[PDB]
Amino acid sequence: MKIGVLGVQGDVREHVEALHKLGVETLIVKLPEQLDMVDGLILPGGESTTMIRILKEMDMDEKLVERINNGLPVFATCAGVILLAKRIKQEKLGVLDITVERNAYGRQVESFETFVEIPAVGKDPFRAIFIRAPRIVETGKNVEILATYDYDPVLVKEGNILACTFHPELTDDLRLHRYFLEMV
Amino acid sequence: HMKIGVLGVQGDVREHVEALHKLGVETLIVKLPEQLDMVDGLILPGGESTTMIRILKEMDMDEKLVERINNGLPVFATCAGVILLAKRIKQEKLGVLDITVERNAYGRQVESFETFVEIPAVGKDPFRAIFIRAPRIVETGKNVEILATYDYDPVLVKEGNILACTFHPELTDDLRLHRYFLEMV
Amino acid sequence: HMKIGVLGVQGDVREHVEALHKLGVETLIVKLPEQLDMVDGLILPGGESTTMIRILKEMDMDEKLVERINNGLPVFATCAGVILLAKRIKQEKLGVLDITVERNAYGRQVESFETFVEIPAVGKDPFRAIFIRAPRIVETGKNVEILATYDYDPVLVKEGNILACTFHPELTDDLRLHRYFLEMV
Amino acid sequence: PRGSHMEIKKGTWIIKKGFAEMFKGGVIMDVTSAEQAKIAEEAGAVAVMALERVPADIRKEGGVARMASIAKIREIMEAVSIPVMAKVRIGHIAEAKILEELGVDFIDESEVLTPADDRFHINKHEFKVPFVCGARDLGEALRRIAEGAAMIRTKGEAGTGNVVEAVKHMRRVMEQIKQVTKMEDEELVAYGKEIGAPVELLREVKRLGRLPVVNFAAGGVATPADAALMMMLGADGVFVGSGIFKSKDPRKMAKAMVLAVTYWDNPRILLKISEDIGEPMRGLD
Amino acid sequence: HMEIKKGTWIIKKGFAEMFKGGVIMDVTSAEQAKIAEEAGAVAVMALERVPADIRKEGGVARMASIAKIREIMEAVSIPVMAKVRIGHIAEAKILEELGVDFIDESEVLTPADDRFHINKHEFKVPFVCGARDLGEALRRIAEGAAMIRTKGEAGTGNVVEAVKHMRRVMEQIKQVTKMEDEELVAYGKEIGAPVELLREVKRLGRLPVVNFAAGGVATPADAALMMMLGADGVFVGSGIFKSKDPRKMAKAMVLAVTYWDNPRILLKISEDIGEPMRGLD
Amino acid sequence: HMEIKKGTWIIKKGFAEMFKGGVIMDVTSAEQAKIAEEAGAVAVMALERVPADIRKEGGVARMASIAKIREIMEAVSIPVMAKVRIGHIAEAKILEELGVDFIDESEVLTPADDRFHINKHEFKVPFVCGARDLGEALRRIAEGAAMIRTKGEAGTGNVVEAVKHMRRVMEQIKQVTKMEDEELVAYGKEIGAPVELLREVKRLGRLPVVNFAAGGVATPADAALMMMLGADGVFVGSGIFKSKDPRKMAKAMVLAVTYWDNPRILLKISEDIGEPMRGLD
């Protein structure tokens, strides 16, 4: 089993290091031809506008979309969500049936960390670190809600896609990452 | 003993002169026309064909080199030499070797490669062929004998008292192709 | 997996440890008595026999090393090791290998030499034998099997689970004699 | 369906240090107008730096370089959705307080502006917003961090189009880190004295095998090749100010920079984005 | 047909042997490239502006634009070289990928690294570097340089520094030729050169790669002198195109390097050459 | 039986590997040689007067008398080493012919050559030389040295210089281990060492020959420290015979080098050792 971490821009190391703690092999995905070399793909945190631009300039977007629709397991954190979203109230991959609002909590000074309850991974709450996070203002038909914070879905699941608006990779909690591998 | 000349208007003249000395023959670097009549054999070294032909003409040595060769003077050409002697090139030339050559046929310098080639005429042990921005012989004539080839292409030909190859034996320590030339004198 | 020990009171312990690691086995440098009971095999390295025996006694490891060996512990000795195990020496010793050895049999260090020796038991390719102020085995016992010799002298013997040679295989890149030892475990 | 709603914490170290991790593999561009901010954002910049005049002009002009006007910064904040950074004079607590209150995403206590304090820097721990500071070696990078810096940028010569100082310092920092990685505690304490850095942070560097915060290359980057080099030397990303807008076709140059930082180890791609970029700033030497 | 090998030392060092007895010319346009090629140049060096202009202008001198280099690559059939700033790995990677025939990590361009040079072993394409003496010529080679050029003052029309250094290198080589091992190891420390290469110089009786004269050659006589001092050939940048009749001057340079020991010919090619650049002194 | 080879690098470098983990003692008589051998010394160094006396006395320190060396050679079965003045080829030739097992071109003797050392490649017998850092350790090796000893202050009873230099060498090695080729070539110039050997150090992660601590070791603890700092063994001259009970001290040294990482044992061999030399400071 080989999990890929999209590496056009973002906190690629943080994720790669998490996967290594879980003992899986990893591959940083920069070129299109590498998308066909992984069982799973993680869309890391970073700048959504940057990711989409590079993705298009390197002709990886259309192939990323196909690959996903063919059931490729994907895990997205913050920027990833905005990247996958179908609606944004900006170019995007448009595959996750949800509507997102960018910089929904304010500027960086507004960034906060709080404990959130994600039943699906245990009784112990998860340390959620929201940095200039987006808000999921509307979930679709098949979009399953795995956890929420103050009336907002912060962790959703639709098909083989797992998306959250916070950064689990910045913590030492490997729980959300296992749950992803469990999807492979 | 015999005296072999190495055309020295430009090129790796030293490499050849040193090979000949290993074979114990006396040498003479040929720069002026009047020196072409002082040798039993002539080696057209590697270097820049365009440079060689230019100097050759500006010094009135070309027409005399051609005559001298047609009168049977033994000649050995490596890379640039071949292009110099060729009758057809896909540029000025001496036009005496009945073949058609394609310059920089393998690409730029980064494409330069070294491989072992089999030259039966000189032994069972393969020869170390070093092709540097080498030319390709795309067509050999009627009397042109093919002494060795690499990937469908003649890399060592012989027509009359002329011996031409597209690689650089002088860059290796294999004196075999040089003996074979002296054997032609 | 197996754990091989390298007696490390003095000598080229690293050279041996590195050989064993190339063969992928786990190693342990044996300095204290209590460590002799933690290994499946023991290598007595090159070095100074007089030094080894002295330390060995001053640390009360000798008597226990002897017992342990007689109880069949696989041992591999190179140069100094042989002198250490020998029963007769033409000096203190462990006295378990039924052979008679002559120290500095070839002369001073300037006499040290390297030659290829044939050790059938490990292959057709000769082994590179490096004798440095080596000892000579002047007499082999009843159960002492001779695995290789050089100029009328046994240079590699085998008696029971002991393998002893007068040269230094660890100084070469030939892991063959080391495998043959592990094969004894 | 409310879900969770327990206590929250803001402006903590994990959040500041963390925010900067998101910038890795990217390019931060200096921008003077809302139009430039947009070009930068369209190009793929991960963030923009609000200024009245880029480093090269700061040199040419002269006078006392201070904090940009609030108007100019709001202009840029409202023009893009990516983080907006603003520079403040070294040691100028007031400017920083004002900026934090304004909501800027990252304050840059930079030396390209007329220093306000000649000895001390801003005690960045007091703030909620993260700070980024310059360093010429491991010693000051480490000191800056001890004061609270969440991100370090290895500086060169601002606005000269010459990567030489940037190279010098990036190599210097990386070299020292590497060394520290293999030092024994007693050597660490000694080294700390030598390069004047806090031993606690040295012990931290020794374990992580790198700086304890994101380190960007800055100063003198004027062409895609330059950006790629910085990455080859170990940078986490680059800051480009004058090199983009001081060239013939900024939008063109900008897209190339972004791609060079991502594909610094891909000659085919580096050559592709270099085929055409316009005329890089002339530079001062 | 069998296994082939590319970018090996024999091929790099070898390629440069082919340049011996020739002239490499700096060219700014496709038109100049053609003049250079018609003149008999063995190779051209692609630039945006020749050394003399690099001085006059100022600012940061970097790698030429890919466009400019392609222009020249497509204009002639002889090898095309391109300069890169010292220590600028990226520029070199780009150039190698572009297919340039020889990279020149030169000092006439604003250095990118202040201490280290490019580790040329990593590349497939050969590099040529400058040196002012045997010590750095040898160091440059240790880093992978397949060809050395003994530099002088770029774009000044004054051969003085070139003479100085060519004499210097040759002098040291000669000396090293007669040193005993213990003296070699000592000398290595003195001139800061790798003892292994010194032992090599000692046997070959010369540098282990082609050595060209460069910097300040502005007239046929200058070129001939360089050869008289032991050069394998010369690099001419400003001296040709900064003169009245470049094509005229160019053909003369090519002939001077070939007939440097022929006064009759040297005089012939000197009878008329136009007006050499004024030079800076 | 087949073709044999003598005095080759593998044999010289190899012979010294056998000394690792041991102590080499300076001896002035056949009686001392025997004490040294009984104590567990791996080899003895033949001298007329130990380092401490060399200091006290004065005058020109040369090679020992053949008589004195034969005395010691015949007294023990362990290898016998003899010192020669730096650069004194003749003394070394004589010693090689005498059959000494290891020549020591040491600086504790009045240097014969002020600039060059002996070209050790010419010899069949191995040489051991001193060094104060990676630069000269490497230079000494380039001249043929099969073993290096990091020196301190001979005959003073003060390990300080030995510590300084052992740390220095080890530090540099460690650094070099993580340098890139271009950095290696540069470093070579800086510390004046042959780049070829630096590349070698970089791979082995250590010197390419055995490195012993030497100078100032006067007590078991000192010997253990040297090992803690990374030495392969120690040379002890004055520290043993200049103490009250030499035989006692000697056995302790041998055990300290072996059990340097065993406090229980280090304390045991320290319980009683006599009075270490007073030392000079």
Side-chain angles (χ1 to χ4, degrees), chain A, chain B, chain C, chain D residues 1-52 54-59 61-285, chain E residues 1-48 50-55 57-281, chain F residues 1-48 50-55 57-281:
Chain A
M1 175 177 90
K2 173 182 284 183
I3 296 298
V5 178
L6 186 62
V8 290
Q9 188 287 310
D11 62 330
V12 177
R13 182 181 61 210
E14 283 59 53
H15 275 293
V16 172
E17 298 188 310
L19 289 179
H20 282 176
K21 286 178 185 175
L22 292 188
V24 331
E25 176 180 53
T26 65
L27 166 67
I28 289 179
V29 176
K30 285 186 173 181
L31 303 174
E33 32 156 299
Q34 296 186 291
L35 283 174
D36 310 310
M37 305 176 59
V38 291
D39 315 305
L41 184 68
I42 295 184
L43 306 190
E47 213 58 49
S48 62
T49 70
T50 292
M51 278 146 98
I52 196 58
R53 173 59 63 268
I54 291 184
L55 241 29
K56 286 178 176 295
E57 301 191 307
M58 294 294 292
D59 302 315
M60 287 184 72
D61 64 312
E62 288 169 57
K63 178 172 181 58
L64 206 199
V65 180
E66 299 190 313
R67 195 72 168 62
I68 292 184
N69 291 312
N70 296 320
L72 171 62
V74 174
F75 179 24
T77 55
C78 182
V81 176
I82 302 179
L83 196 52
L84 299 177
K86 279 185 176 298
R87 303 165 283 290
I88 309 176
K89 36 179 296 186
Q90 188 189 330
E91 305 170 297
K92 59 199 156 302
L93 298 173
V95 301
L96 195 61
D97 187 48
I98 57 173
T99 304
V100 304
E101 182 186 308
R102 294 187 55 183
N103 310 302
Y105 303 94
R107 291 280 176 179
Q108 162 61 28
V109 66
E110 295 315 319
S111 291
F112 64 93
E113 64 175 313
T114 184
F115 275 105
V116 175
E117 305 192 309
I118 309 177
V121 300
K123 70 165 192 170
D124 307 297
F126 198 93
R127 188 186 185 189
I129 300 175
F130 307 78
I131 299 173
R132 289 183 103 244
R135 173 183 296 133
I136 289 178
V137 297
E138 182 279 303
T139 52
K141 293 182 178 67
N142 298 299
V143 172
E144 165 174 43
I145 290 189
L146 294 173
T148 72
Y149 167 70
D150 192 72
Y151 304 109
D152 298 307
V154 302
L155 178 48
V156 303
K157 176 176 180 174
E158 191 202 324
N160 272 307
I161 297 178
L162 179 63
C164 73
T165 62
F166 50 92
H167 295 290
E169 71 276 24
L170 294 188
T171 58
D172 286 310
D173 209 322
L174 304 179
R175 276 187 296 172
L176 285 180
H177 278 74
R178 292 200 190 73
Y179 185 102
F180 174 65
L181 297 180
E182 206 61 50
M183 293 175 65
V184 190
Chain B
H1 50 302
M2 69 191 290
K3 174 181 283 181
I4 296 299
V6 179
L7 186 63
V9 289
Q10 189 286 311
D12 62 328
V13 176
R14 182 181 61 211
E15 283 59 52
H16 275 292
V17 173
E18 298 187 309
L20 289 180
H21 283 176
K22 287 179 184 177
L23 293 188
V25 330
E26 176 179 53
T27 65
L28 166 68
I29 288 178
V30 176
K31 285 185 173 183
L32 303 174
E34 32 156 298
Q35 295 185 293
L36 283 174
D37 309 312
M38 306 177 57
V39 291
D40 315 305
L42 185 67
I43 295 182
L44 307 190
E48 213 58 50
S49 63
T50 69
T51 292
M52 278 146 96
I53 196 59
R54 173 59 62 268
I55 292 184
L56 241 29
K57 286 178 175 295
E58 302 191 306
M59 294 295 293
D60 301 316
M61 286 184 73
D62 64 312
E63 288 168 57
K64 178 171 181 59
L65 206 200
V66 180
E67 299 190 314
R68 195 72 166 63
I69 292 185
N70 291 312
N71 296 319
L73 172 62
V75 175
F76 180 22
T78 56
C79 182
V82 176
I83 301 180
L84 196 51
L85 299 177
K87 279 185 177 297
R88 302 165 283 290
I89 309 177
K90 307 201 304 177
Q91 188 186 329
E92 304 172 291
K93 60 198 156 303
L94 298 173
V96 302
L97 195 60
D98 187 48
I99 59 172
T100 305
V101 304
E102 182 186 307
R103 293 187 56 183
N104 309 302
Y106 303 93
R108 292 279 176 180
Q109 162 61 28
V110 66
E111 295 315 319
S112 291
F113 64 93
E114 65 175 314
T115 184
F116 275 104
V117 175
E118 305 191 309
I119 308 176
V122 300
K124 70 165 191 171
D125 307 297
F127 198 92
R128 187 187 185 188
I130 300 174
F131 307 77
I132 299 174
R133 289 182 103 243
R136 173 184 296 133
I137 289 178
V138 298
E139 182 279 303
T140 52
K142 293 182 178 67
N143 298 298
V144 173
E145 165 175 42
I146 289 187
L147 294 173
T149 71
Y150 167 71
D151 192 73
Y152 304 109
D153 297 307
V155 301
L156 178 49
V157 303
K158 176 177 181 174
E159 192 202 324
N161 272 306
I162 298 178
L163 180 62
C165 75
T166 62
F167 50 92
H168 295 290
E170 71 277 17
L171 293 188
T172 59
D173 286 309
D174 209 322
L175 305 178
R176 277 187 295 172
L177 284 180
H178 279 73
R179 291 199 190 73
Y180 185 101
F181 174 64
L182 298 180
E183 206 61 50
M184 292 175 68
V185 191
Chain C
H1 50 302
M2 69 191 290
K3 174 181 283 181
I4 296 299
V6 179
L7 186 63
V9 289
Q10 189 286 311
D12 62 328
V13 176
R14 182 181 61 211
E15 283 59 52
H16 275 292
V17 173
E18 298 187 309
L20 289 180
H21 283 176
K22 287 179 184 177
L23 293 188
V25 330
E26 176 179 53
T27 65
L28 166 68
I29 288 178
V30 176
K31 285 185 173 183
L32 303 174
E34 32 156 298
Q35 295 185 293
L36 283 174
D37 309 312
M38 306 177 57
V39 291
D40 315 305
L42 185 67
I43 295 182
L44 307 190
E48 213 58 50
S49 63
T50 69
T51 292
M52 278 146 96
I53 196 59
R54 173 59 62 268
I55 292 184
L56 241 29
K57 286 178 175 295
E58 302 191 306
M59 294 295 293
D60 301 316
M61 286 184 73
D62 64 312
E63 288 168 57
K64 178 171 181 59
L65 206 200
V66 180
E67 299 190 314
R68 195 72 166 63
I69 292 185
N70 291 312
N71 296 319
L73 172 62
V75 175
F76 180 22
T78 56
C79 182
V82 176
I83 301 180
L84 196 51
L85 299 177
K87 279 185 177 297
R88 302 165 283 290
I89 309 177
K90 307 201 304 177
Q91 188 186 329
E92 304 172 291
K93 60 198 156 303
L94 298 173
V96 302
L97 195 60
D98 187 48
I99 59 172
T100 305
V101 304
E102 182 186 307
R103 293 187 56 183
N104 309 302
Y106 303 93
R108 292 279 176 180
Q109 162 61 28
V110 66
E111 295 315 319
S112 291
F113 64 93
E114 65 175 314
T115 184
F116 275 104
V117 175
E118 305 191 309
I119 308 176
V122 300
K124 70 165 191 171
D125 307 297
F127 198 92
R128 187 187 185 188
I130 300 174
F131 307 77
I132 299 174
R133 289 182 103 243
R136 173 184 296 133
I137 289 178
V138 298
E139 182 279 303
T140 52
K142 293 182 178 67
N143 298 298
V144 173
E145 165 175 42
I146 289 187
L147 294 173
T149 71
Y150 167 71
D151 192 73
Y152 304 109
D153 297 307
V155 301
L156 178 49
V157 303
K158 176 177 181 174
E159 192 202 324
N161 272 306
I162 298 178
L163 180 62
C165 75
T166 62
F167 50 92
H168 295 290
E170 71 277 17
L171 293 188
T172 59
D173 286 309
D174 209 322
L175 305 178
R176 277 187 295 172
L177 284 180
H178 279 73
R179 291 199 190 73
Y180 185 101
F181 174 64
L182 298 180
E183 206 61 50
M184 292 175 68
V185 191
Chain D
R2 189 169 196 185
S4 297
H5 60 175
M6 289 178 266
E7 184 215 61
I8 59 168
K9 308 173 73 166
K10 302 182 178 190
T12 62
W13 181 251
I14 184 59
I15 294 175
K16 302 186 184 187
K17 194 196 81 63
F19 179 29
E21 301 280 48
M22 304 306 133
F23 296 135
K24 289 204 294 294
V27 180
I28 294 166
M29 309 178 176
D30 282 7
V31 299
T32 289
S33 68
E35 177 169 63
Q36 302 198 311
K38 290 179 182 175
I39 293 173
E41 184 180 57
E42 288 169 44
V46 308
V48 299
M49 185 86 87
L51 301 178
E52 295 279 4
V54 294
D57 309 320
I58 295 186
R59 301 184 89 89
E61 299 184 310
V64 176
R66 320 188 186 71
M67 166 183 72
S69 68
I70 302 304
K72 176 58 70 176
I73 298 170
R74 284 183 173 298
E75 179 188 343
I76 295 169
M77 292 185 107
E78 289 161 41
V80 298
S81 66
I82 57 184
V84 175
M85 304 185 158
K87 283 177 150 131
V88 293
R89 287 176 286 173
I90 287 177
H92 210 308
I93 309 159
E95 298 191 329
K97 293 291 187 183
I98 288 166
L99 245 39
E100 177 169 51
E101 181 74 26
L102 177 59
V104 148
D105 297 294
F106 232 107
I107 300 192
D108 179 27
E109 194 180 10
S110 104
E111 55 301 316
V112 325
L113 264 46
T114 305
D117 197 311
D118 187 49
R119 287 222 300 157
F120 316 80
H121 287 244
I122 297 173
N123 173 14
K124 305 156 207 68
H125 297 107
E126 291 300 312
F127 294 74
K128 266 177 168 49
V129 55
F131 274 79
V132 47
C133 305
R136 289 174 296 159
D137 83 295
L138 187 58
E140 57 179 297
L142 249 23
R143 284 198 283 303
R144 246 66 285 169
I145 296 170
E147 309 177 318
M151 171 187 212
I152 291 295
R153 74 177 192 296
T154 302
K155 63 186 168 183
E157 304 172 305
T160 57
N162 198 338
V163 286
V164 73
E165 290 305 298
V167 173
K168 184 184 169 208
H169 302 162
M170 184 50 73
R171 286 186 98 78
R172 178 54 182 164
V173 163
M174 294 290 105
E175 178 193 308
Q176 295 172 288
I177 293 180
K178 232 143 289 187
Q179 284 177 53
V180 159
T181 294
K182 289 185 164 178
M183 293 184 100
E184 281 311 330
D185 197 67
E186 72 278 13
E187 293 181 288
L188 245 45
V189 163
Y191 193 54
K193 179 186 172 179
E194 188 171 63
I195 72 174
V199 79
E200 257 323 303
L201 290 178
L202 274 174
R203 301 202 236 259
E204 182 68 10
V205 166
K206 189 267 199 56
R207 45 188 296 285
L208 303 188
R210 55 165 125 106
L211 265 189
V213 302
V214 176
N215 187 19
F216 269 39
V221 165
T223 75
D226 287 11
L229 186 59
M230 287 317 122
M231 298 302 278
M232 286 179 205
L233 270 26
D236 291 320
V238 294
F239 273 89
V240 180
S242 315
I244 287 172
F245 292 115
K246 278 301 179 184
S247 66
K248 288 299 183 295
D249 187 2
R251 180 170 169 297
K252 193 64 179 172
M253 180 64 83
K255 291 201 164 194
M257 296 293 225
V258 166
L259 284 168
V261 171
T262 290
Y263 298 103
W264 60 269
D265 40 34
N266 200 301
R268 180 176 59 79
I269 294 185
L270 283 183
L271 172 57
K272 179 195 166 189
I273 67 185
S274 293
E275 290 294 332
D276 168 57
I277 52 174
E279 186 64 53
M281 58 184 282
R282 274 180 294 293
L284 187 67
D285 176 42
Chain E
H1 65 175
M2 280 200 98
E3 180 188 301
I4 62 168
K5 309 173 72 165
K6 301 182 179 189
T8 60
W9 181 251
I10 184 60
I11 295 174
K12 301 187 184 186
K13 195 197 81 63
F15 179 30
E17 301 281 48
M18 305 307 132
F19 296 136
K20 290 205 293 294
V23 180
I24 294 168
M25 309 178 175
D26 282 7
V27 299
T28 288
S29 68
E31 178 169 63
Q32 302 198 311
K34 291 179 182 175
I35 292 172
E37 183 180 58
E38 288 169 44
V42 308
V44 299
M45 185 86 87
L47 301 179
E48 294 279 5
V50 295
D53 309 321
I54 295 186
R55 301 183 89 90
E57 300 184 310
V60 175
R62 321 187 186 70
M63 167 182 69
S65 69
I66 301 304
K68 176 58 70 177
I69 298 172
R70 283 185 174 298
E71 180 188 341
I72 295 169
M73 292 185 106
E74 288 161 41
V76 297
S77 67
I78 57 184
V80 176
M81 304 185 157
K83 282 176 150 131
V84 293
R85 287 175 285 174
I86 288 177
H88 210 308
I89 309 159
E91 298 191 329
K93 293 291 188 183
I94 289 169
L95 246 40
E96 177 169 52
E97 181 74 26
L98 176 58
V100 148
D101 297 294
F102 232 106
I103 301 191
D104 180 27
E105 194 180 10
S106 102
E107 55 301 316
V108 324
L109 263 47
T110 305
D113 197 309
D114 188 48
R115 288 223 300 156
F116 317 80
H117 287 243
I118 298 173
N119 172 15
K120 306 156 207 68
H121 297 107
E122 291 300 312
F123 295 74
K124 264 176 170 50
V125 54
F127 275 78
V128 47
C129 305
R132 289 174 296 159
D133 83 295
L134 187 59
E136 56 180 297
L138 248 22
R139 284 199 283 303
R140 245 67 285 169
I141 296 170
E143 309 176 318
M147 171 188 213
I148 292 294
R149 74 178 192 296
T150 302
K151 63 186 169 183
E153 304 172 305
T156 57
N158 198 337
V159 287
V160 73
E161 291 305 298
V163 172
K164 184 185 169 206
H165 302 163
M166 183 51 72
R167 287 185 98 77
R168 179 54 182 164
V169 163
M170 293 290 105
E171 177 193 308
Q172 294 173 290
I173 294 182
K174 232 142 289 187
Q175 284 176 53
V176 159
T177 293
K178 289 185 163 177
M179 293 184 100
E180 282 312 330
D181 197 67
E182 72 277 14
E183 294 181 288
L184 246 45
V185 163
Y187 193 54
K189 178 187 172 177
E190 188 172 64
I191 72 173
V195 80
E196 257 323 303
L197 290 178
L198 274 174
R199 301 203 236 260
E200 182 68 10
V201 166
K202 189 267 198 55
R203 45 189 296 284
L204 303 188
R206 56 166 125 106
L207 265 189
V209 302
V210 175
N211 187 17
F212 268 39
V217 165
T219 76
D222 287 10
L225 187 59
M226 286 320 123
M227 299 301 279
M228 285 181 207
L229 270 27
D232 291 320
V234 293
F235 274 88
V236 180
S238 316
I240 287 172
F241 291 115
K242 278 301 179 184
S243 66
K244 288 299 183 295
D245 187 2
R247 181 170 169 297
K248 193 63 179 171
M249 181 64 82
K251 291 200 164 194
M253 296 293 224
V254 165
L255 285 168
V257 171
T258 291
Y259 297 102
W260 59 270
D261 40 34
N262 201 300
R264 181 175 59 79
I265 295 185
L266 284 181
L267 172 56
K268 179 196 167 189
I269 66 185
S270 292
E271 290 293 332
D272 168 56
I273 52 174
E275 186 64 54
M277 58 184 282
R278 274 180 295 293
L280 187 68
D281 176 43
Chain F
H1 65 175
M2 280 200 98
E3 180 188 301
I4 62 168
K5 309 173 72 165
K6 301 182 179 189
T8 60
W9 181 251
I10 184 60
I11 295 174
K12 301 187 184 186
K13 195 197 81 63
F15 179 30
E17 301 281 48
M18 305 307 132
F19 296 136
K20 290 205 293 294
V23 180
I24 294 168
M25 309 178 175
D26 282 7
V27 299
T28 288
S29 68
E31 178 169 63
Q32 302 198 311
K34 291 179 182 175
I35 292 172
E37 183 180 58
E38 288 169 44
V42 308
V44 299
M45 185 86 87
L47 301 179
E48 294 279 5
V50 295
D53 309 321
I54 295 186
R55 301 183 89 90
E57 300 184 310
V60 175
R62 321 187 186 70
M63 167 182 69
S65 69
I66 301 304
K68 176 58 70 177
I69 298 172
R70 283 185 174 298
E71 180 188 341
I72 295 169
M73 292 185 106
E74 288 161 41
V76 297
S77 67
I78 57 184
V80 176
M81 304 185 157
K83 282 176 150 131
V84 293
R85 287 175 285 174
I86 288 177
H88 210 308
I89 309 159
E91 298 191 329
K93 293 291 188 183
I94 289 169
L95 246 40
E96 177 169 52
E97 181 74 26
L98 176 58
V100 148
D101 297 294
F102 232 106
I103 301 191
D104 180 27
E105 194 180 10
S106 102
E107 55 301 316
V108 324
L109 263 47
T110 305
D113 197 309
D114 188 48
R115 288 223 300 156
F116 317 80
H117 287 243
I118 298 173
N119 172 15
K120 306 156 207 68
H121 297 107
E122 291 300 312
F123 295 74
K124 264 176 170 50
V125 54
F127 275 78
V128 47
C129 305
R132 289 174 296 159
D133 83 295
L134 187 59
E136 56 180 297
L138 248 22
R139 284 199 283 303
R140 245 67 285 169
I141 296 170
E143 309 176 318
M147 171 188 213
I148 292 294
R149 74 178 192 296
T150 302
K151 63 186 169 183
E153 304 172 305
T156 57
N158 198 337
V159 287
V160 73
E161 291 305 298
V163 172
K164 184 185 169 206
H165 302 163
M166 183 51 72
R167 287 185 98 77
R168 179 54 182 164
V169 163
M170 293 290 105
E171 177 193 308
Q172 294 173 290
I173 294 182
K174 232 142 289 187
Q175 284 176 53
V176 159
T177 293
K178 289 185 163 177
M179 293 184 100
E180 282 312 330
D181 197 67
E182 72 277 14
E183 294 181 288
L184 246 45
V185 163
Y187 193 54
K189 178 187 172 177
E190 188 172 64
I191 72 173
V195 80
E196 257 323 303
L197 290 178
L198 274 174
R199 301 203 236 260
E200 182 68 10
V201 166
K202 189 267 198 55
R203 45 189 296 284
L204 303 188
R206 56 166 125 106
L207 265 189
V209 302
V210 175
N211 187 17
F212 268 39
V217 165
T219 76
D222 287 10
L225 187 59
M226 286 320 123
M227 299 301 279
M228 285 181 207
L229 270 27
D232 291 320
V234 293
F235 274 88
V236 180
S238 316
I240 287 172
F241 291 115
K242 278 301 179 184
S243 66
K244 288 299 183 295
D245 187 2
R247 181 170 169 297
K248 193 63 179 171
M249 181 64 82
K251 291 200 164 194
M253 296 293 224
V254 165
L255 285 168
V257 171
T258 291
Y259 297 102
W260 59 270
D261 40 34
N262 201 300
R264 181 175 59 79
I265 295 185
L266 284 181
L267 172 56
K268 179 196 167 189
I269 66 185
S270 292
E271 290 293 332
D272 168 56
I273 52 174
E275 186 64 54
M277 58 184 282
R278 274 180 295 293
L280 187 68
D281 176 43

